[PDB]
Nucleic acid binder design. Sequence first.
RNA 1: UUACCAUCAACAUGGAAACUUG
RNA 2: CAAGUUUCCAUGUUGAUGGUA
Length: 351
Amino acid sequence: RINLRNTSFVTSEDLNWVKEVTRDASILTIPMHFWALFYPKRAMDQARELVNMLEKIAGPIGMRISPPAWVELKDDRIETYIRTIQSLLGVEGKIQMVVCIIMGTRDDLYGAIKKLCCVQSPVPSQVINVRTIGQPTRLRSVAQKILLQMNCKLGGELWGVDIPLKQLMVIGMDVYHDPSRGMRSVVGFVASINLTLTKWYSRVVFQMPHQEIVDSLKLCLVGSLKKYYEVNHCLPEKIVVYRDGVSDGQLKTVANYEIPQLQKCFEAFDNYHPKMVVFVVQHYICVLNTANLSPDHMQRLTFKLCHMYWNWPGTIRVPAPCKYAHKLAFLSGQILHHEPAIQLCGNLFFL
RNA sequence: UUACCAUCAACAUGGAAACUUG
RNA sequence: CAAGUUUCCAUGUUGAUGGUA
């Protein structure tokens, strides 16, 4: 099911392995040097153990891991971070990541850091909490998962899957109705860029009512198709949409209203009419069947696409391409409330 | 906001019915 | 025609508790 470099990956019994695994390579390992690490005053030797363990055994990933740019924090105050946390673009401007260990689990620290790491300075980064990783005897797996998160976050990937259906791009989305104030109804969008589902293009859509979302949807979809033609030069032919986040009550007013002028985006250019699949997820029922093939071959396709969560390798509840946009939705429509940046939409910087 | 698996507390919307006002 | 005192709940989110890790 799962592959790797120079070998296939392990498929266990209940497909959960977790305990000190990935003793082997990955798809891409760019050599990480300029990942400026910030440690606070209250976890000095803990962060020393973190760096020393990241250099040593975490499985032969192939990550050419090197000593980082070590930064030491005075305290955890607001003025301490907010002086220079733009993910450290002050002097050189040639950075990749900034890694921070934070003690106070105050959510506004996340809000400011991820806002000026997404839109004010578009940079992927990972934060570390002391109260979950601060002890040894479990350091192996959390160090491994930090390395795998960096692997996904540097524009590299962990694995892929074979696809028996030719030239397939996976369209997935998830609505986030805001329960607090404003009723944003933020809908994400994911699509595959490469043939083996390794590079992913993922947009975020921002619109106040439920009516003029469709224009931004069509703009994002023609941008995605232009990017697909740029990166592939042979146009995709299979289109499957995994719709989730709509109950039985909203099904009639959405599955018969939104999707026809979502389909109408294909009149921006000529010579195009591929096969369309739109499902529901709650259990799987289709609401648009244009591919006209057997249910078993595409139910197997959906069961395969359930299995590629690139931070949690294992079983999940709904299909994964729902959740790359779902976690993007509580990244943006809950925390950020800002339009996404151009470059990282080709990566999974939401994870 | 890690790496999900459960639980409960704090809350936001909706269903089912007694008191009672304009 | 609706506001309340509301009793049960359901639908979801935030923290914490135990963890696998």
